[PDB]
Structures are given as structure tokens and as C-alpha cells.
Design a protein around this nucleic acid. Structure first.
Ligand SMILES: [Mg+2]
Ligand SMILES: [Mg+2]
Ligand SMILES: [Mg+2]
Ligand SMILES: [Mg+2]
Ligand SMILES: [Mg+2]
Ligand SMILES: [Mg+2]
Ligand SMILES: [Mg+2]
Ligand SMILES: [Mg+2]
Ligand SMILES: [Mg+2]
Ligand SMILES: [Mg+2]
Ligand SMILES: [Mg+2]
Ligand SMILES: [Mg+2]
Ligand SMILES: [Mg+2]
Ligand SMILES: [Mg+2]
Ligand SMILES: [Mg+2]
Ligand SMILES: [Mg+2]
Ligand SMILES: [Mg+2]
Ligand SMILES: [Mg+2]
Ligand SMILES: [Mg+2]
Ligand SMILES: [Mg+2]
Ligand SMILES: [Mg+2]
Ligand SMILES: [Mg+2]
Ligand SMILES: [Mg+2]
Ligand SMILES: [Mg+2]
Ligand SMILES: [Mg+2]
Ligand SMILES: [Mg+2]
Ligand SMILES: [Mg+2]
Ligand SMILES: [Mg+2]
Ligand SMILES: [Mg+2]
Ligand SMILES: [Mg+2]
Ligand SMILES: [Mg+2]
Ligand SMILES: [Mg+2]
Ligand SMILES: [Mg+2]
Ligand SMILES: [Mg+2]
Ligand SMILES: [Mg+2]
Ligand SMILES: [Mg+2]
Ligand SMILES: [Mg+2]
Ligand SMILES: [Mg+2]
Ligand SMILES: [Mg+2]
Ligand SMILES: [Mg+2]
Ligand SMILES: [Mg+2]
Ligand SMILES: [Mg+2]
Ligand SMILES: [Mg+2]
Ligand SMILES: [Mg+2]
Ligand SMILES: [Mg+2]
Ligand SMILES: [Mg+2]
Ligand SMILES: [Mg+2]
Ligand SMILES: [Mg+2]
Ligand SMILES: [Mg+2]
Ligand SMILES: [Mg+2]
Ligand SMILES: [Mg+2]
Ligand SMILES: [Mg+2]
Lengths: 121, 159, 169, 58, 296, 211
RNA sequence: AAGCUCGUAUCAGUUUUAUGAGGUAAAGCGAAUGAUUAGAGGUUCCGGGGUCGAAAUGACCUUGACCUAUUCUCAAACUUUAAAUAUGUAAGAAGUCCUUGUUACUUAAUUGAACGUGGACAUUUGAAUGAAGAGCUUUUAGUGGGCCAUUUUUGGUAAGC
RNA sequence: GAGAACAGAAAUCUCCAGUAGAACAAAAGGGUAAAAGCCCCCUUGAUUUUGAUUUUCAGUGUGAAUACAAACCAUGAAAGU
RNA sequence: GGUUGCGGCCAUAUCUACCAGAAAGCACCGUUUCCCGUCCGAUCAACUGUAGUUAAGCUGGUAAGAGCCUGACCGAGUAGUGUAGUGGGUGACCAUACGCGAAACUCAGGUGCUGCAAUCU
């Protein structure tokens, strides 16, 4: 929380639905495997590395992530930082670098993160 | 020209605390330091002999030596892009045992306990410190408590 | 109450203020010597006046503090000179009292034209017992008000024994 | 010909290029500066137990 | 006090009150700091002090150490213990000051082990000497003289105390030049005199010297010495045998007591006044604004 | 030779008072700060109107003095020297330097040149206390003074009794009870603190129920 | 640039927790020092003037000073209080305990101090996040005119100073 | 502050109050009240040997300083210094 | 619980004014042959504990007391401040956004806690 605090003017974030963690992992989900950034795309890629911890599928992954499981550090780090595109139909704001509250795009915009993250995914 | 003497800039720093001038109380001398002891450094102005330099004010180091009226404290001072080692010879009046480690030290004793308390039971421990978690769901009642509605207030002056 | 919160005399301190050092001052010491029995003490000028004709540390005067029965005698015999009539001042608000008398011959003491004539300040300091508290090394305390020497207390002390007057207003 | 006097500009830039090198700790630090009366005796003391722990292996 | 004197807010508000035990005019910290601080490399070694203090005629001898929680009495001998050993009179005097000290030396050197080893000087001829280390043995019990505010005068009896602890067996580092019969004008100690004082020669000699110059006073004081038929001469053996007796059983007996601690605690709250409740106080004020305001 | 005040409007530098370190500074042009019937009792002058700064800036000893003269002149002419109490609430303690002008900018530390009072936003500059039946004339007084100052200043009808610290009714409640007692031109208030004794000494009028 | 010794090790221009340090901003001035407006009540065998006067250590007015409780206003080189940012240390295997050797140091004392021997407790072994790893060595280039922005800020009326 | 002949604004004598408003060579700032100031007493440690340390720093020198070790002394009843 | 000797923290202990203090203890107090120190046996030194006293010291208690200590959504989320913007405004300056956050003030409560040893109706 204090980390986030420190980087509000440069990021956008909120609470993400099941719907959007799923379509994150399914579509742009990659593992860090001897670095190398390997695409998920088969369940054996996961069990291979996250299996140590329970977790032997793409949906096991998602689950451990959304429920913030006991092994979230391992689960979440396994996933390479997602690399999404620009929001499709734009940012909705005319000037990005303001708080969400002030009509701009950065800050905690809560459940409104999903609407965005989708457009950019 | 400029002036940069040993104690320069140290007006308020070596000053004495309000209504706390006078002798140093006798406990400052009964305390007992050993090697390896962590001490916090704060100069006492009334005591001129064996003062730390201003740089080492509010600094914390480790006892590496014990002499008749003094302890040798080693500090890591960093200069350039690196730390070098500094042995400071301090008088017992500019040193106090540090609390920087009692919480740890308290926590260990404590951890060893509820670990044997748990072992001798049926394992099941969890004893790393976790940080402040977000709070859980909860229900707030109205029995005795209906929300009072506030509005913003007009402009005024009183002057 | 009143038991021994009596009123003794602490000490008699007569002092001769000469304007200078040398023969005049030593003769004035000699006076206080053979009057007190005790070998007297000299005092130096504290600063320099030039119109009072004195230099710092000049040795400018003499005096002596006499306690016990001895004091009673001299106090008395000057109180003679003063015909037992003082003034409402003379008495400090703290309870002591002092008076002036010139011509030291005017109380016992012959003349001798080799010792000349001198004037003298008389100053009687008063106390009750247990004064030592405010005076000893250890546990140095202070006399409770109900024991401190008033001015009024002393004036009537003075009036009564001595059968002297106080005069003025 | 006056010129710039002094600045700290860009110095932390440089310190951080290659470090601020955490101070480097050793188990068994040195006795450098340790009171010699101590050290004199401490020598004989070790010598002692060394000798003992030799005689232990007989 | 007087009007013009009278302390303002500011005076009092900025006031740095001293250590209590200084306001009390009891403890001198400058000496204390230097009496007590130990070598930092001598770790939890206590620095034992020989406290000597004279009341208005009762001599106190304690051996103290310091603890940040508060000083610690190893052992204590008071000169009022001396009737036990055959001294009923003059318990503020030099020779009582000696005995008591001697007692405190024996008492603790006992409770420490070096009861038997370290007897000090049994003789006592006023010779100048501190107790020496035994060849292969435990070094003596070392103690430092806490004089307090006593003024060091040569002849003072604070040192009589000292010389008894030193004659006892204690190591109490010291010089001669403050013992009765030290020569101003030759670095030299007549011990024919300091012996006297130990045994009380000055007091006895005063007695014989008043036996026939003035008997009015010699009965006014030495009243006791009369009422118990102890004329001078005996006084040296009075003390000599106290010595004997002291070494023979220093072990300290406490008061028999009668009336429990609990009991003293009773008949004392009797005479202790009770602090008042703030409810009570406001009922004094309101009480007073009824009187002093409402036109009586 | 007096530099245009435009030169010193803003608080660009940090308080430069007259001091052991300063010393050689000129005197303040503004020197009387309480004009009008200043001896008057608190009860005599309930209405208090203010001249209030709307800017963080600096006012000269001169523009204080000028503006002082201006209002007091108006107020006495239209209501008499005893109709009001003018208090200047602001003292010019900040010394202004100048670089009098061999050489040019080498070592250019100024000499004292003049004084300003450094003033906040909302900071009161003038206060006036009268009787309400003089309002408009008092107000006009301050209005005319405004012209003598840079910056925007507001004039505010106060809520308080005179130069007193309590709004009129609060003062009233106290005064028509015991509480208030008269001083020079102020008032001493009954404390519920301190000695009971020399508390009824002062304020004999309190310590009574009704009337 | 050459590498070298190692490898999940150890590593951090970050947070968190625990414990220190600080005298800036603010604030304060019916708190010290130092400034500054106003009255009110005091006090003189005791600064000066005036009426009475033979004077008075006389009474009375009088303005000054000082005292008391109040009042408007200030401080880079004032201050009781005292932030925000920034800053020292600690968060374990180099750990915590127990059992009792060594010495010439040290103790009244095998007392202590230091260094050990022997034994008891494993990764929820002791916060977070991250780590295309960590440590170490040698050698050498260029450079040693800088300038700009937001914020803090000194001199200057000011400056694209 | 209140008191005492000559004696006055200021000479010397006494008592009360006194957080330091004094004094401590000197600039200023720290510091200090049974003292770090004032008076007295005894003195030469302002000495000997050769290292470590802190500030300035390249972690060179120089200056100044700190805590020890090994001597020899001073002073004190002593702990000490 | 009282008291003393040695203390720790060093005002909840200090300051001002009253009042109460049994018993013990401390104290004040008596004396000047002796050691010792003074202009002065006041301090300091000795001696008695005998001739005297709770007057003072000391301890405690009272006070819309001074001070000091503690608390609180009392003031004040104020002042100040880290972060943000192609925010406002000629400017001076000011709002807003995510954070941190005082001091005065006001009111309430309080007025030494306590260690070792000896002693005491
Ligand atoms: Mg779309
Ligand atoms: Mg569309
Ligand atoms: Mg499109
Ligand atoms: Mg746009
Ligand atoms: Mg898309
Ligand atoms: Mg400079
Ligand atoms: Mg240089
Ligand atoms: Mg003090
Ligand atoms: Mg020195
Ligand atoms: Mg009586
Ligand atoms: Mg002359
Ligand atoms: Mg050039
Ligand atoms: Mg240029
Ligand atoms: Mg250059
Ligand atoms: Mg006063
Ligand atoms: Mg007040
Ligand atoms: Mg001493
Ligand atoms: Mg600015
Ligand atoms: Mg400027
Ligand atoms: Mg030119
Ligand atoms: Mg010019
Ligand atoms: Mg110049
Ligand atoms: Mg205007
Ligand atoms: Mg006010
Ligand atoms: Mg500063
Ligand atoms: Mg400020
Ligand atoms: Mg403040
Ligand atoms: Mg301000
Ligand atoms: Mg002020
Ligand atoms: Mg400042
Ligand atoms: Mg940090
Ligand atoms: Mg990782
Ligand atoms: Mg790697
Ligand atoms: Mg290079
Ligand atoms: Mg080069
Ligand atoms: Mg070049
Ligand atoms: Mg930029
Ligand atoms: Mg100085
Ligand atoms: Mg002292
Ligand atoms: Mg020399
Ligand atoms: Mg060189
Ligand atoms: Mg060098
Ligand atoms: Mg009794
Ligand atoms: Mg004699
Ligand atoms: Mg006597
Ligand atoms: Mg005596
Ligand atoms: Mg009484
Ligand atoms: Mg007492
Ligand atoms: Mg109070
Ligand atoms: Mg800000
Ligand atoms: Mg902007
Ligand atoms: Mg604002």
C-alpha cells in the first residue's frame, strides 16, 4: 500500500474482477522459466514450475491469484508482467496525468480498473 | 573566509536540554558496556573530554573495545560511493545501550517459546511477522445509532 | 508558642571606615584591637574613586566581629554614649540594629596622642537559637518565619531589657 | 574570468552508477585498537587452551 | 516573604531544581560520582564504600555498593551497639569511633570468609599500617572511605572510624596526616598519642584533670562515669576489653523488637493526616463563596 | 530619492530587523499608532471596523503614516477627535536595503533605506472602535485610507465588542453578570482560577445571583 | 577492457515494523533574551520641576523613571514547544540457550572478561517487494569552461543578471 | 531591598532575597553552582617512550584533538584526577 | 506506616502562606582539657549525652494559590508540509487531488514514586 502510494502519478490501478484476471491469464499469460518468458498455453508448463505449490493448471494459477492464496508470492511472480496495448477506444479523459478523481487517468480507480484493462487487453 | 572547525555548526546540537543542565546523573556511570554491545551516540556538552564529532551524533555503532572510562565504538561512515570503518573512542557519557534490537531480542525469546509450545503440542505455528492486513467484512448497527447528516457550511468571518 | 525562640545577640560588628591606608588605618586597627581583644581584620577598597582618594585593593579600613558576653559589654558601653536613645531606622527589617558614635574615647578607653581619635559604626546582629541551621555545612536550611527575627520583635526586645528609648516615627 | 564555484550536481548519479557498496561484514573482525593489556593476556589465554586442546588429542 | 522579593511565574517556571539528595543538603554528587564509578573494564565489579557518619551522638558504619536501583548495604555497625561489648558511655568519641569501625571490619570480614585469615593488628600500639596481602591467598576486602560532608581535619574522628576498619583487617587505603598527633612541622607521626586516642586517653586524661580543678562540672558531665563508679584509669581497659570482645563475636544481633512491623504501622496512621478529595475541596470553595461573598 | 515603493512590494527577502547586527537604520515614518479617544472605556465603543489585507505584501512606514493621517483627519473632521479610536495594528519592523550608487556589482550589500511592515492575507492593518451611530463615517475613513496602500485590502464589519476579544453578546452576558471590570481602555475578566481570596477583592460586583 | 572465484546465493537510489538522532517550517512573546503601541493601579528619607513654607528624613500637586496586573506588534544571526521531507541502527545459522576449560588480564573470591570444548532447537530459520545473479582483481581513455526547468534559496530595484 | 559616625550617586560594615541575570585572557557559540566561577594550600603530567583513533581527507600530509599501553611524578584521608 | 544512614529517577519533589506532628530518630542544644580552625569555638575541631527544647530544622496537611506533571475528536485535521496537473490569477498569491501533520489555546485530573540496611508505640 505504501508502495502504491508512492507511484500513483504514474500508474492506474483498481480491484480486478474474476472476469479480467481470467482474460489476463488466458490471453497474455506468460511464465518466467529460466527467465525466458514462456507462454502459458498448456497446463504442463505450469505444473512444471508452480506444481511444487499445488497449482497444476492455468485455472489453478488464476485461482491462487484471485483468492490471494498462501502461495501468492510464488504464483504471481511466476507470471511475467503483463504487456498490454493502449486502451482500445481511448482513455476517456483528455489529459492522462491527473488523478482519476480529478478527471484524469492515474490513481486507484477501483472497480473501474476492469473497464480499462479490458480495452487495453 | 569560511570556518569549519571541529565543532562548527554545532550550536543547538551539543546544547543541554531545557531544565536538564547540571551534573550527569549517576546512572550514566553505573551502566556497563561489553564488546559487541550496540550503542546509540549522542554528545553531552557538559562533558568536553571524549566527545564524539558532530557527524556521529544520532549515529549507532558497536562496541569493539572497553577501556577505563570509555568504550570504543565502530561506526560505518560512508564517503564517496562506499563505507569505510571508523573506530570512535567515546566516553561513557556520550553513549547509551541501544533499544534498536530489544524488539528483535524480545521476539526471539518469544518465538522460541510458542515454537516449543507448538511443537510439544501438534506443530501448527506461523511465526513470521506479517504486515498490516486489510480489514475484514463487518456489520455496523443502528441500534442507538442513526446517521446524522452533515452539510457544508456557508462563508463567515468573526473578527 | 515561646520556649527558647528567645533572642540572643548573634554578634557585634564594629567597623572603622578610614579613607586610606598607612599610619591612620593602623592606629584605627589598634583601636579596635584593644577594644575587642581579638586581632582585627582589614578591608581593601573594592574599586577606585579618586575623589575619595582610594585605589582598588588599597587597604582602606578595619573592623572586627565580637560575639558572646564580650559583645554585650561594648554594645552596652556605646549604648551609653548614645544615652540609650536610637531611632525607628537603625533597625533593619530583618531584625538587626546598628548605630554610629564618633570619638571612640567616649566609651572607656583613654586618649593617647599617638593613636588619635576615631569614629566607629556599631552593628548588632540578632538571632534566635537554631540559627545554625542556616549556617552549618550539612542540611543547610532556612529559619521558619515564626522564628525569623522581625524588626518590631527586636525593637521591643531592645526597648525592654536596656530600658532605652527608640524615639522618632 | 570568473567561473562556476562548486556544485554537488550529478554526484549521487555517479555514486550510484557503481554502488554505494554496503559496508561488508566479517565474522572475526580485527583486534585493531583493542586495549593492549587485554590483548597481551588474551594471547596467553588462547595459547593456554590451544595447548589444552592439543593435549586433548593424545 | 517581603513584597518586593516574591517569585514570579517566570522565575519558578524556568527553575531547574537540583537533585533531591542535594536540596536536602545531604549528598555531595561530585564526590559521589568519583567514589562510585568503576573501571569500565572491571565490569560488574562493585565499588564498596565505607560510609562513616556521625549523628548527634551515634556513629554509623556501613559498607555500601551501588546499584542503579539504589545503593546496597553489605553490612552495618552502629556505635550504639557498643554497650554489647562493654561500652556504655561516650559513643561519639574518637575511641568509640575506633571500636565501631573495628566492629564493622570484623563483622563483614567474618561474613565474607576471611574471618580467620586477615586478623589485622591484634596488638594496637598506634603504629601506622594497612593490611597486607597474604602470600598465596585471597587479597583482602578492599573498601574506600565515604566521609560525606565531614571536613577533613587532622585529628578528626571520621578517621578514627577509618583506623578501626584498617586495624580490623580491611584494606582501606589511607595516610597518617589526619590522625591525632601528626606533626604540622615535620612529616612525622607521634604514635604515643594516636594510641592514646584509640583507647581514649584524651577523655580519661580530661577526667583526672577535672577530678581536682573543678568538681562542679566534672559531675555536671562525667555524671555517668560517676554514677557507675568508673574513674579514669579503668577507661583504657574498658576499651581494650571491648576490642577483645568485639573480635570474639562480631556477629551482630538485631533488636529483640516487640510490637510487629504491622503494629508500628497501626499507631502511626493515627498521627498521619489524610489527603483530601476534590469533591470535598469544591465543597470548601462553594462553602467559601457562600460566606465571604454573600455579605456574611 | 525615496525609491518607488514598487521596488519593495513583495516579501522577497527574510526579516531584516533593526538589531546589534543592523544598528545603522533610519527611523520609522509611522510613529503614533493609537489616535482618537484611546483613553475611552470598553463599554463606550461597541462597534469595531477593520482594514484587512487581501495580499501577502509589504507596507512602508511611509504609506502607513500617510494612510494613518488620512483616516484620522477624516474621522475627526466629520465626527470629532473623540468619536473614535484609531489603532494601527501593524508595525514596520523589517528594514529595507539599498545599493547606493568606482565599481558596479562587486560586493553589493545594501544600506538600510526604509522600513516596511510585512503583512499577511487577512492580516488586520487598521482597527477602529466607535458607537454604531458612526459606522458609515468610520467606514469611509478606512475607505479613504485604502487609497494610500498598495495591494487589495477589504474592510470588515466586526462581530466583536470594540477591540475586545468577545462578540458583542458574549461580552454582554459576561458584563451584565459579574465578570468584566474596567482597566485603562480595556478590561480585566473574572477568572475561575487562582486564589479565592484576592479574587473577590477584585470584582466585588460578581458573587451574587440575580440583578 | 580483460577477466577471475563462486552461485541461489548473496543482492537493493523501495516499503514495513522496532528503536534512535535533528531544531528547519509552523508556532510563541499577559515564557527567557531582544524589539514595539497604549493606557490603568502602585512606589520613593531617594531625578527634576512648582504651592505652602524658618526648615523638615514636611504635607500637597507634578512629570519622569522603576513595580504590579493588563494591552497592539516583531526576530537570519531569539525561543519553551515543535513538524512534513530527509537520516543512524536492528529484523537470526556469523542465531538463541545450557554444560564448565584457558590466562600472566581482572575480582574479596575460578569472581569476571575475552577465546574455546561438550550439548539442546531447521527452513513460517523468523517482515514486504524485487533480483537476466553475487563477490572480487588488474589495468587504461576521455573529462576536470558546463548550461536549463520545477521546488528550497543568497546578493541585487531589476535582468535572457 | 533594608540597615550603621565623618560618608555624599559611588568608600567600609551587616542581614535578607538572588537559576546564574556573574565570572571563566581573547571573537562568538556551547558548557559550568558544595563548579568549570572566588579565596586558600601543595605543586610541575606544560614530563618520558613508541603505536591506534577523530576532524579536514586522496580516507596523503599538516594543525588540533580522543582513548589506551609502558615509565616517572604531582596532589588528595581517599575513590580518584 | 514513622525515622535514620546510603541511594535511583531528579519539581506530581520546587515556590508562597498558614496549621498539625505521638513514639523513636534526627535535630536544635551544653562544654573548651585534648587534636584541629577561626578577626569571632558562628562555621570548622574536639568533649558530654550530662544541663535544656519541639521554637526552628525535618515530616505532613490546608490553598476556586504560583509553578510543574498527565490527559482529551478543546482548538485543529487548523498552521505547516511530501507528491500531481498545459489547475485559477497581470501579478502577489490561491484553490483542488493522494498523503503526513503541529504549537498556542481551552477544559479535566494530579502534586513525589521508590531501593538497601538499622530502628520505633
Ligand atoms: Mg472496444
Ligand atoms: Mg466503439
Ligand atoms: Mg477508433
Ligand atoms: Mg487537450
Ligand atoms: Mg485489444
Ligand atoms: Mg562562516
Ligand atoms: Mg580549502
Ligand atoms: Mg543547577
Ligand atoms: Mg584538555
Ligand atoms: Mg518550645
Ligand atoms: Mg581620606
Ligand atoms: Mg580566470
Ligand atoms: Mg559567468
Ligand atoms: Mg570549474
Ligand atoms: Mg520581583
Ligand atoms: Mg500567569
Ligand atoms: Mg570532597
Ligand atoms: Mg517565496
Ligand atoms: Mg533577495
Ligand atoms: Mg570598472
Ligand atoms: Mg551600483
Ligand atoms: Mg561590508
Ligand atoms: Mg489599496
Ligand atoms: Mg489575547
Ligand atoms: Mg540551524
Ligand atoms: Mg518563523
Ligand atoms: Mg509555540
Ligand atoms: Mg509569522
Ligand atoms: Mg519576548
Ligand atoms: Mg529561526
Ligand atoms: Mg530510511
Ligand atoms: Mg523473485
Ligand atoms: Mg538469475
Ligand atoms: Mg580511470
Ligand atoms: Mg585527470
Ligand atoms: Mg579546459
Ligand atoms: Mg524538467
Ligand atoms: Mg564564551
Ligand atoms: Mg562538591
Ligand atoms: Mg609545552
Ligand atoms: Mg603529501
Ligand atoms: Mg598527519
Ligand atoms: Mg521526642
Ligand atoms: Mg584554645
Ligand atoms: Mg557551639
Ligand atoms: Mg564539629
Ligand atoms: Mg511547631
Ligand atoms: Mg535533617
Ligand atoms: Mg495550582
Ligand atoms: Mg505542500
Ligand atoms: Mg503551477
Ligand atoms: Mg491557506
Amino acid at each position: 500500500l505504501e508502495l502504491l502510494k508512492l507511484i500513483e502519478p504514474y500508474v492506474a490501478y483498481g480491484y480486478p474482477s474474476y472476469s479480467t484476471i481470467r482474460q489476463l491469464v488466458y490471453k497474455r499469460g506468460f511464465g518466467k522459466i529460466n527467465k525466458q518468458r514462456v507462454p502459458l498455453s498448456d497446463n504442463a508448463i505450469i505444473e512444471a514450475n508452480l506444481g511444487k505449490y499445488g497449482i497444476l493448471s492455468i485455472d489453478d494459477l488464476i485461482h491462487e491469484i484471485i483468492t490471494v492464496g498462501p502461495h501468492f508470492k510464488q504464483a504471481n511472480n511466476f507470471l511475467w508482467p503483463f504487456k498490454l496495448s493502449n486502451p482500445s477506444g481511448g482513455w476517456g479523459v483528455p489529459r492522462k496525468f491527473k488523478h482519476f478523481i480529478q478527471g484524469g487517468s492515474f490513481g486507484n480507480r477501483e472497480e473501474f480498473i476492469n473497464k480499462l484493462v479490458k480495452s487495453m487487453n | 573566509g569560511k570556518s569549519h572547525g571541529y565543532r562548527s555548526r554545532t550550536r543547538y546540537m551539543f546544547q543541554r536540554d531545557f531544565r536538564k543542565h547540571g551534573a550527569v546523573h549517576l546512572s550514566t556511570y553505573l551502566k556497563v558496556y561489553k564488546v559487541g554491545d550496540i550503542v546509540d551516540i549522542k554528545a553531552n556538552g557538559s562533558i568536553q573530554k571524549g566527545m564524539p564529532h558532530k557527524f556521529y551524533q544520532g549515529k549507532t555503532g558497536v562496541v569493539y573495545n572497553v577501556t577505563k572510562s570509555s568504550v570504543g565504538v565502530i561506526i560505518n561512515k560512508m564517503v564517496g560511493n562506499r563505507y569505510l570503518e571508523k573506530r570512535l573512542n567515546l566516553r561513557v557519557e556520550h553513549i547509551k545501550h541501544s533499544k534498536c534490537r530489544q524488539e528483535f531480542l524480545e521476539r526471539v525469546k518469544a518465538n522460541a517459546a510458542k515454537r516449543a509450545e507448538a511443537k510439544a503440542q501438534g506443530v501448527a505455528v506461523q511465526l513470521k511477522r506479517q504486515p498490516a492486513q486489510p480489514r475484514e467484512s463487518r456489520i455496523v448497527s443502528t441500534e442507538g445509532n442513526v446517521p446524522q447528516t452533515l452539510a457544508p457550511v456557508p462563508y463567515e468571518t468573526f473578527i | 508558642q515561646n520556649p527558647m525562640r528567645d533572642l540572643k545577640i548573634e554578634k557585634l560588628v564594629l567597623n572603622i571606615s578610614v579613607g586610606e591606608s598607612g599610619d591612620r588605618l593602623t592606629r584605627a586597627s589598634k583601636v579596635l584591637e584593644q577594644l575587642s581583644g581579638q586581632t582585627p581584620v582589614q578591608s581593601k577598597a573594592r574599586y577606585t574613586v579618586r575623589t575619595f582618594g582610594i585605589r582598588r585593593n588599597e587597604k582602606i579600613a578595619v573592623h572586627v566581629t565580637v560575639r558572646g558576653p564580650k559583645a554585650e559589654e561594648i554594645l552596652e558601653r556605646g549604648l551609653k554614649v548614645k544615652e540609650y536613645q536610637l531611632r525607628d531606622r537603625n533597625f533593619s527589617a530583618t531584625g538587626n540594629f546598628g548605630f554610629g558614635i564618633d570619638e571612640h574615647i567616649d566609651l572607656g578607653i583613654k586618649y593617647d596622642p599617638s593613636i588619635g581619635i576615631f569614629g566607629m559604626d556599631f552593628y548588632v546582629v540578632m538571632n534566635r537559637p537554631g540559627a545554625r541551621v542556616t549556617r552549618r555545612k550539612r542540611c543547610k536550611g532556612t529559619v521558619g518565619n515564626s522564628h525569623k527575627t522581625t524588626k518590631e520583635d527586636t525593637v521591643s526586645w531592645f526597648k525592654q531589657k536596656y530600658d532605652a528609648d527608640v524615639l522618632d516615627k | 574570468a570568473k567561473s562556476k564555484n562548486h556544485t554537488a550536481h550529478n554526484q549521487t548519479r555517479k555514486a550510484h552508477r557503481n554502488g554505494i557498496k554496503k559496508p561488508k561484514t566479517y565474522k572475526y573482525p580485527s583486534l585493531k585498537g583493542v586495549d593492549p593489556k587485554f590483548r597481551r593476556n588474551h594471547k596467553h589465554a588462547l595459547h593456554g587452551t590451544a595447548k589444552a586442546l592439543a593435549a586433548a588429542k593424545k | 516573604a517581603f513584597q518586593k522579593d516574591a517569585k514570579s511565574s517566570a522565575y519558578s517556571s524556568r527553575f531547574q531544581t537540583p537533585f533531591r539528595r542535594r536540596r536536602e543538603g545531604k549528598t555531595d554528587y561530585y564526590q559521589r560520582k568519583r567514589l562510585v564509578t568503576q573501571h569500565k573494564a572491571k565490569y560488574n565489579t562493585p565499588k564498596y564504600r565505607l560510609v562513616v557518619r556521625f549523628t548527634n551522638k551515634d556513629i554509623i558504619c556501613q559498607i555500601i555498593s551501588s546499584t542503579i536501583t539504589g545503593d546496597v548495604v553489605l553490612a552495618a555497625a552502629y556505635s550504639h551497639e557498643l554497650p554489647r561489648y562493654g561500652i556504655t558511655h561516650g559513643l561519639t568519641n574518637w575511641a568509640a569511633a575506633y571500636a565501631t569501625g573495628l566492629l564493622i571490619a570484623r563483622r563483614t570480614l567474618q561474613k565474607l570468609g576471611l574471618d580467620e585469615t586477615y586478623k589485622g593488628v591484634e596488638e594496637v600500639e598506634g603504629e601506622y599500617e594497612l593490611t597486607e596481602a597474604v602470600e598465596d591467598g585471597p587479597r583482602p576486602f578492599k573498601v574506600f572511605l565515604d566521609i560525606g560532608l565531614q571536613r577533613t581535619t587532622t585529628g578528626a574522628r571520621v578517621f578514627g572510624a577509618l583506623k578501626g576498619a584498617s586495624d580490623g583487617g580491611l584494606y582501606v587505603p589511607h595516610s597518617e596526616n589526619r590522625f591525632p598527633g601528626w606533626d604540622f612541622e615535620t612529616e612525622e607521626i607521634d604514635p604515643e598519642l594516636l594510641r592514646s586516642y584509640i583507647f581514649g586517653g584524651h577523655v580519661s586524661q580530661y577526667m583526672e584533670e577535672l577530678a581536682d580543678d573543678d568538681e562542679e562540672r566534672f559531675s555536671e558531665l562525667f555524671k555517668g562515669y560517676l554514677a557507675d563508679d568508673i574513674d579514669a584509669d579503668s577507661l583504657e581497659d574498658i576499651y581494650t576489653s571491648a576490642h577483645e570482645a568485639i573480635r570474639a563475636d562480631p556477629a551482630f544481633k538485631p533488636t529483640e523488637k516487640k510490637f510487629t512491623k504491622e503494629q508500628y504501622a497501626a499507631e502511626s496512621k493515627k498521627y498521619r493526616q489524610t489527603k483530601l478529595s476534590k469533591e470535598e475541596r469544591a465543597a470548601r470553595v462553594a462553602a467559601k463563596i457562600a460566606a465571604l461573598a454573600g455579605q456574611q | 530619492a525615496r525609491r518607488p515603493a514598487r521596488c519593495y512590494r513583495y516579501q522577497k527577502n527574510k526579516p531584516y530587523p533593526k538589531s546589534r547586527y543592523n544598528r545603522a537604520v533610519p527611523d520609522s515614518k509611522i510613529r503614533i499608532y493609537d489616535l482618537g479617544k484611546k483613553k475611552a472605556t470598553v463599554d463606550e465603543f461597541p462597534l469595531c471596523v477593520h482594514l484587512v489585507s487581501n495580499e501577502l505584501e509589504q507596507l512602508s512606514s511611509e504609506a502607513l503614516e500617510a494612510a494613518r493621517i488620512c483616516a484620522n483627519k477624516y474621522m475627526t473632521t466629520v465626527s470629532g477627535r473623540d468619536a473614535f479610536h484609531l489603532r494601527v495594528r501593524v508595525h514596520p519592523f523589517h528594514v529595507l536595503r539599498i545599493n547606493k550608487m568606482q565599481q558596479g556589482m562587486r560586493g553589493a550589500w545594501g544600506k538600510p533605506h526604509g522600513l516596511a511592515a510585512r503583512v499577511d492575507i487577512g492580516q488586520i492593518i487598521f482597527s477602529v472602535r466607535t458607537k454604531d451611530s458612526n459606522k458609515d463615517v468610520v467606514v469611509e475613513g478606512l475607505r479613504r485610507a485604502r487609497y494610500k496602500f498598495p495591494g487589495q485590502q477589504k474592510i470588515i464589519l466586526s462581530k466583536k465588542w470594540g477591540f475586545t476579544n468577545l462578540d458583542r453578546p458574549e461580552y454582554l452576558k459576561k458584563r451584565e453578570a459579574g465578570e468584566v471590570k474596567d482597566d485603562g481602555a480595556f478590561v480585566k475578566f473574572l477568572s475561575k482560577k487562582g486564589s479565592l481570596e484576592n479574587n473577590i477583592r477584585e470584582f466585588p460586583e460578581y458573587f451574587a445571583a440575580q440583578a
